[PDB]
Design a protein around this ligand. Sequence first.
Ligand code: 3EB
Length: 331
Amino acid sequence: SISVTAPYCRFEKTGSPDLEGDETVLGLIEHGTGHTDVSLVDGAPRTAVHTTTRDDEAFTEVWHAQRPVESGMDNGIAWARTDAYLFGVVRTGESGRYADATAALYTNVFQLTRSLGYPLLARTWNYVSGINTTNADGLEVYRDFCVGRAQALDEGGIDPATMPAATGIGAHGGGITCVFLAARGGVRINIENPAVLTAHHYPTTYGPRPPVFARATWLGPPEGGRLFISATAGILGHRTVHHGDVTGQCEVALDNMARVIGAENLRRHGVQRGHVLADVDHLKVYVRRREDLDTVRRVCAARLSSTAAVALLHTDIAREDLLVEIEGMVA
Ligand SMILES: O=C(O)CCc1cccc(C(=O)O)c1
Protein backbone atom coordinates (compact mmCIF):
# COMPACT_ATOMS: atom_id res chain seq x y z
CA SER A 1 0.00 0.00 0.00
CA ILE A 2 2.28 2.74 1.32
CA SER A 3 5.52 3.12 -0.70
CA VAL A 4 8.53 2.16 1.45
CA THR A 5 12.23 1.74 0.69
CA ALA A 6 14.68 0.00 3.05
CA PRO A 7 18.08 1.62 3.77
CA TYR A 8 20.84 1.39 1.21
CA CYS A 9 24.31 2.76 0.68
CA ARG A 10 26.31 4.81 -1.82
CA PHE A 11 30.00 5.71 -1.85
CA GLU A 12 30.70 9.23 -3.05
CA LYS A 13 33.73 11.43 -3.59
CA THR A 14 34.05 13.76 -0.62
CA GLY A 15 33.71 17.39 -1.68
CA SER A 16 32.01 16.50 -4.97
CA PRO A 17 28.90 18.47 -6.01
CA ASP A 18 25.42 17.09 -5.48
CA LEU A 19 24.61 16.83 -9.15
CA GLU A 20 21.26 15.00 -8.84
CA GLY A 21 19.57 16.41 -5.70
CA ASP A 22 18.67 13.05 -4.22
CA GLU A 23 15.95 13.48 -1.57
CA THR A 24 16.61 9.96 -0.25
CA VAL A 25 19.80 10.89 1.66
CA LEU A 26 19.54 9.97 5.34
CA GLY A 27 23.06 10.63 6.58
CA LEU A 28 26.74 10.76 5.76
CA ILE A 29 29.98 9.41 7.23
CA GLU A 30 33.19 10.98 5.93
CA HIS A 31 36.10 8.52 6.03
CA GLY A 32 39.43 10.27 5.87
CA THR A 33 42.41 11.63 7.76
CA GLY A 34 40.64 13.55 10.53
CA HIS A 35 37.44 13.87 12.51
CA THR A 36 34.70 16.41 13.29
CA ASP A 37 31.75 16.80 15.63
CA VAL A 38 28.35 15.31 14.80
CA SER A 39 25.85 17.73 13.27
CA LEU A 40 22.88 18.01 10.92
CA VAL A 41 23.53 19.33 7.42
CA ASP A 42 20.15 20.22 5.91
CA GLY A 43 18.51 17.47 7.93
CA ALA A 44 21.20 14.87 7.31
CA PRO A 45 23.35 13.65 10.22
CA ARG A 46 27.02 13.91 9.37
CA THR A 47 30.40 13.32 10.92
CA ALA A 48 33.96 12.55 9.83
CA VAL A 49 35.93 9.62 11.22
CA HIS A 50 39.68 9.16 11.06
CA THR A 51 39.68 5.74 9.43
CA THR A 52 42.61 6.08 7.03
CA THR A 53 46.02 7.71 6.70
CA ARG A 54 46.06 9.11 3.13
CA ASP A 55 43.73 11.80 1.76
CA ASP A 56 43.51 9.95 -1.56
CA GLU A 57 41.64 7.17 0.31
CA ALA A 58 39.04 9.52 1.75
CA PHE A 59 35.44 9.05 0.63
CA THR A 60 31.89 9.60 1.88
CA GLU A 61 29.66 6.72 2.93
CA VAL A 62 26.08 7.90 2.29
CA TRP A 63 23.01 6.14 3.69
CA HIS A 64 19.70 6.47 1.86
CA ALA A 65 16.15 5.24 2.16
CA GLN A 66 13.49 7.68 1.01
CA ARG A 67 12.75 11.33 1.77
CA PRO A 68 13.30 11.80 5.50
CA VAL A 69 10.25 13.06 7.32
CA GLU A 70 12.00 14.48 10.42
CA SER A 71 15.52 15.04 11.74
CA GLY A 72 16.89 16.18 15.08
CA MET A 73 19.60 16.00 17.70
CA ASP A 74 19.12 14.42 21.13
CA ASN A 75 21.78 13.56 23.70
CA GLY A 76 24.55 14.09 21.13
CA ILE A 77 22.85 11.85 18.56
CA ALA A 78 22.09 13.44 15.21
CA TRP A 79 19.31 11.51 13.51
CA ALA A 80 17.03 11.42 10.50
CA ARG A 81 13.99 9.19 10.08
CA THR A 82 11.60 8.07 7.41
CA ASP A 83 8.32 6.64 8.67
CA ALA A 84 9.91 3.15 8.54
CA TYR A 85 13.65 3.62 9.30
CA LEU A 86 16.03 5.72 11.42
CA PHE A 87 19.72 6.67 10.94
CA GLY A 88 21.78 8.09 13.81
CA VAL A 89 25.32 9.14 14.59
CA VAL A 90 26.89 10.00 17.95
CA ARG A 91 30.42 10.22 19.37
CA THR A 92 32.39 10.64 22.57
CA GLY A 93 35.72 12.42 22.80
CA GLU A 94 39.28 11.13 22.85
CA SER A 95 39.94 10.15 26.47
CA GLY A 96 42.00 8.10 28.88
CA ARG A 97 38.93 5.96 29.69
CA TYR A 98 35.92 4.85 27.60
CA ALA A 99 33.70 2.30 29.36
CA ASP A 100 31.49 4.73 31.26
CA ALA A 101 31.17 7.07 28.26
CA THR A 102 30.42 4.13 25.93
CA ALA A 103 27.74 2.79 28.28
CA ALA A 104 26.17 6.26 28.33
CA LEU A 105 26.35 6.59 24.54
CA TYR A 106 24.72 3.20 23.98
CA THR A 107 22.12 3.96 26.66
CA ASN A 108 21.26 7.08 24.71
CA VAL A 109 21.02 5.10 21.44
CA PHE A 110 18.70 2.48 22.97
CA GLN A 111 16.61 5.21 24.58
CA LEU A 112 16.30 7.20 21.34
CA THR A 113 15.25 4.13 19.37
CA ARG A 114 12.60 3.43 22.00
CA SER A 115 11.38 7.03 22.28
CA LEU A 116 11.15 7.64 18.53
CA GLY A 117 9.55 4.23 17.86
CA TYR A 118 12.36 2.46 15.94
CA PRO A 119 13.17 -0.36 18.37
CA LEU A 120 14.72 -2.87 15.91
CA LEU A 121 18.39 -2.10 15.48
CA ALA A 122 19.55 -3.15 12.01
CA ARG A 123 23.25 -2.27 11.84
CA THR A 124 25.82 -0.62 14.10
CA TRP A 125 29.34 0.68 13.53
CA ASN A 126 31.95 1.63 16.13
CA TYR A 127 35.01 3.62 15.02
CA VAL A 128 37.31 3.36 18.04
CA SER A 129 40.33 5.65 18.27
CA GLY A 130 43.40 3.69 19.39
CA ILE A 131 41.52 0.39 19.49
CA ASN A 132 44.68 -1.60 20.42
CA THR A 133 46.25 1.06 22.63
CA THR A 134 46.24 0.74 26.41
CA ASN A 135 43.93 3.14 28.25
CA ALA A 136 44.83 5.18 31.37
CA ASP A 137 43.50 2.39 33.57
CA GLY A 138 45.86 -0.17 32.00
CA LEU A 139 43.26 -1.93 29.79
CA GLU A 140 43.19 -2.29 26.00
CA VAL A 141 40.80 0.27 24.51
CA TYR A 142 38.79 -2.38 22.61
CA ARG A 143 38.18 -4.25 25.87
CA ASP A 144 37.22 -1.01 27.68
CA PHE A 145 34.77 -0.27 24.83
CA CYS A 146 33.33 -3.80 25.11
CA VAL A 147 32.77 -3.33 28.86
CA GLY A 148 30.80 -0.15 28.18
CA ARG A 149 28.70 -1.62 25.39
CA ALA A 150 27.89 -4.68 27.51
CA GLN A 151 26.96 -2.47 30.48
CA ALA A 152 24.53 -0.49 28.32
CA LEU A 153 22.72 -3.67 27.27
CA ASP A 154 22.17 -4.50 30.94
CA GLU A 155 21.08 -0.92 31.68
CA GLY A 156 18.49 -1.20 28.93
CA GLY A 157 17.31 -4.76 29.55
CA ILE A 158 18.52 -5.58 26.04
CA ASP A 159 18.78 -9.21 24.91
CA PRO A 160 22.28 -9.66 23.37
CA ALA A 161 20.77 -11.85 20.63
CA THR A 162 18.92 -8.74 19.33
CA MET A 163 22.13 -6.87 18.50
CA PRO A 164 22.49 -6.74 14.72
CA ALA A 165 25.43 -6.71 12.32
CA ALA A 166 28.33 -4.62 13.60
CA THR A 167 31.80 -3.23 13.02
CA GLY A 168 34.37 -2.59 15.78
CA ILE A 169 37.33 -1.01 14.04
CA GLY A 170 40.17 1.41 14.78
CA ALA A 171 40.49 5.09 14.12
CA HIS A 172 43.63 7.24 14.25
CA GLY A 173 42.04 9.92 16.46
CA GLY A 174 38.68 11.17 17.64
CA GLY A 175 37.46 9.00 20.51
CA ILE A 176 34.61 6.61 19.77
CA THR A 177 31.99 7.17 17.06
CA CYS A 178 28.82 5.08 16.79
CA VAL A 179 26.64 4.94 13.68
CA PHE A 180 23.38 2.99 13.55
CA LEU A 181 20.36 2.06 11.48
CA ALA A 182 17.06 1.06 13.10
CA ALA A 183 13.55 0.06 12.00
CA ARG A 184 10.06 0.97 13.16
CA GLY A 185 9.08 -2.68 12.97
CA GLY A 186 8.84 -5.47 10.47
CA VAL A 187 11.44 -8.09 9.69
CA ARG A 188 14.87 -7.93 11.33
CA ILE A 189 16.63 -11.31 11.37
CA ASN A 190 20.04 -11.61 13.00
CA ILE A 191 22.25 -14.23 11.39
CA GLU A 192 25.12 -16.28 12.78
CA ASN A 193 27.99 -18.06 10.93
CA PRO A 194 28.09 -21.86 11.47
CA ALA A 195 31.89 -22.07 11.91
CA VAL A 196 32.29 -18.92 14.02
CA LEU A 197 31.46 -18.65 17.69
CA THR A 198 28.70 -16.17 18.62
CA ALA A 199 30.49 -13.01 19.78
CA HIS A 200 28.87 -12.74 23.20
CA HIS A 201 29.86 -16.38 23.83
CA TYR A 202 33.56 -15.63 23.39
CA PRO A 203 35.71 -16.97 26.24
CA THR A 204 37.15 -14.68 28.86
CA THR A 205 40.52 -14.46 27.12
CA TYR A 206 38.86 -11.66 25.11
CA GLY A 207 37.27 -10.03 28.19
CA PRO A 208 36.53 -8.97 30.84
CA ARG A 209 33.28 -8.51 28.87
CA PRO A 210 32.74 -10.18 25.49
CA PRO A 211 31.83 -8.38 22.31
CA VAL A 212 28.20 -8.62 21.20
CA PHE A 213 26.93 -8.54 17.61
CA ALA A 214 25.37 -10.69 14.90
CA ARG A 215 27.40 -11.87 11.88
CA ALA A 216 24.80 -10.39 9.42
CA THR A 217 21.27 -8.98 9.57
CA TRP A 218 18.41 -9.34 7.09
CA LEU A 219 16.20 -6.23 7.20
CA GLY A 220 12.85 -5.69 5.50
CA PRO A 221 10.39 -7.54 3.29
CA PRO A 222 11.50 -10.52 1.19
CA GLU A 223 11.38 -8.26 -1.88
CA GLY A 224 13.06 -4.98 -1.05
CA GLY A 225 14.94 -6.17 2.02
CA ARG A 226 18.66 -5.92 2.58
CA LEU A 227 21.40 -8.17 3.91
CA PHE A 228 23.93 -6.24 6.01
CA ILE A 229 27.16 -8.18 6.64
CA SER A 230 29.27 -7.38 9.72
CA ALA A 231 32.93 -6.55 9.54
CA THR A 232 34.30 -10.06 8.99
CA ALA A 233 37.75 -11.29 10.04
CA GLY A 234 40.04 -14.28 9.53
CA ILE A 235 38.68 -16.23 12.49
CA LEU A 236 37.53 -19.85 12.86
CA GLY A 237 35.56 -20.60 16.03
CA HIS A 238 36.72 -17.64 18.14
CA ARG A 239 40.35 -17.99 17.12
CA THR A 240 42.46 -15.76 14.94
CA VAL A 241 43.85 -17.92 12.12
CA HIS A 242 46.70 -17.31 9.65
CA HIS A 243 48.84 -15.40 12.15
CA GLY A 244 51.05 -12.86 10.41
CA ASP A 245 49.60 -13.85 7.01
CA VAL A 246 47.35 -11.11 5.63
CA THR A 247 46.60 -13.05 2.44
CA GLY A 248 45.39 -16.08 4.40
CA GLN A 249 43.37 -13.93 6.81
CA CYS A 250 41.78 -12.09 3.88
CA GLU A 251 40.88 -15.41 2.17
CA VAL A 252 39.28 -16.73 5.38
CA ALA A 253 37.45 -13.43 5.97
CA LEU A 254 35.98 -13.70 2.46
CA ASP A 255 35.19 -17.39 3.08
CA ASN A 256 33.35 -16.40 6.27
CA MET A 257 31.39 -13.73 4.39
CA ALA A 258 30.44 -16.28 1.70
CA ARG A 259 29.33 -18.77 4.35
CA VAL A 260 27.16 -16.26 6.20
CA ILE A 261 25.27 -15.23 3.05
CA GLY A 262 25.08 -18.70 1.47
CA ALA A 263 21.80 -20.35 0.55
CA GLU A 264 21.77 -22.98 3.26
CA ASN A 265 22.81 -20.66 6.09
CA LEU A 266 20.17 -18.14 5.07
CA ARG A 267 17.54 -20.90 4.80
CA ARG A 268 18.41 -22.08 8.30
CA HIS A 269 17.71 -18.50 9.52
CA GLY A 270 14.39 -18.23 7.65
CA VAL A 271 15.68 -16.12 4.74
CA GLN A 272 14.60 -17.56 1.42
CA ARG A 273 17.29 -16.77 -1.13
CA GLY A 274 21.04 -17.26 -1.02
CA HIS A 275 23.94 -15.17 -2.27
CA VAL A 276 27.54 -15.42 -3.42
CA LEU A 277 30.43 -13.00 -2.97
CA ALA A 278 29.84 -11.47 -6.41
CA ASP A 279 26.49 -10.19 -5.07
CA VAL A 280 28.04 -8.12 -2.28
CA ASP A 281 28.46 -4.37 -2.80
CA HIS A 282 29.53 -1.22 -0.92
CA LEU A 283 32.39 -3.02 0.75
CA LYS A 284 34.87 -1.50 3.15
CA VAL A 285 38.13 -3.38 3.57
CA TYR A 286 40.11 -2.41 6.67
CA VAL A 287 43.83 -3.17 6.53
CA ARG A 288 46.22 -2.81 9.46
CA ARG A 289 49.54 -2.31 7.61
CA ARG A 290 50.10 0.15 4.76
CA GLU A 291 52.44 -2.37 3.14
CA ASP A 292 49.52 -4.87 2.96
CA LEU A 293 46.93 -2.69 1.25
CA ASP A 294 47.84 -3.61 -2.32
CA THR A 295 48.23 -7.29 -1.35
CA VAL A 296 44.72 -7.23 0.06
CA ARG A 297 43.31 -5.24 -2.85
CA ARG A 298 44.49 -7.97 -5.22
CA VAL A 299 43.08 -10.82 -3.13
CA CYS A 300 39.74 -9.08 -2.97
CA ALA A 301 39.73 -8.23 -6.69
CA ALA A 302 40.09 -11.93 -7.51
CA ARG A 303 36.88 -12.79 -5.64
CA LEU A 304 34.63 -9.70 -5.53
CA SER A 305 32.63 -8.47 -8.51
CA SER A 306 34.45 -6.01 -10.76
CA THR A 307 31.40 -3.70 -10.52
CA ALA A 308 31.29 -3.68 -6.70
CA ALA A 309 32.12 -0.44 -4.92
CA VAL A 310 35.11 -1.29 -2.71
CA ALA A 311 36.95 1.10 -0.41
CA LEU A 312 40.21 0.16 1.32
CA LEU A 313 40.97 1.95 4.61
CA HIS A 314 44.29 1.80 6.46
CA THR A 315 43.38 1.33 10.14
CA ASP A 316 43.68 -1.09 13.06
CA ILE A 317 41.45 -4.08 13.84
CA ALA A 318 39.82 -5.09 17.17
CA ARG A 319 42.60 -7.63 17.95
CA GLU A 320 46.26 -6.77 17.37
CA ASP A 321 46.74 -10.09 15.53
CA LEU A 322 43.92 -9.42 13.06
CA LEU A 323 45.34 -7.84 9.93
CA VAL A 324 42.31 -7.28 7.69
CA GLU A 325 38.51 -7.23 7.82
CA ILE A 326 35.76 -6.79 5.25
CA GLU A 327 32.17 -5.55 5.59
CA GLY A 328 29.51 -4.99 2.94
CA MET A 329 25.86 -5.55 2.02
CA VAL A 330 23.54 -7.14 -0.49
CA ALA A 331 20.93 -4.66 -1.73
O1 3EB B 1 35.33 -10.76 16.69
C1 3EB B 1 35.44 -10.70 15.47
O2 3EB B 1 34.88 -11.54 14.68
C2 3EB B 1 36.31 -9.66 14.80
C3 3EB B 1 36.15 -8.27 15.44
C4 3EB B 1 34.78 -7.62 15.31
C5 3EB B 1 33.98 -7.80 14.19
C6 3EB B 1 32.75 -7.14 14.09
C7 3EB B 1 32.32 -6.31 15.10
C8 3EB B 1 33.08 -6.14 16.25
C9 3EB B 1 32.60 -5.29 17.39
O3 3EB B 1 33.14 -5.36 18.51
O4 3EB B 1 31.55 -4.56 17.18
C10 3EB B 1 34.32 -6.79 16.33
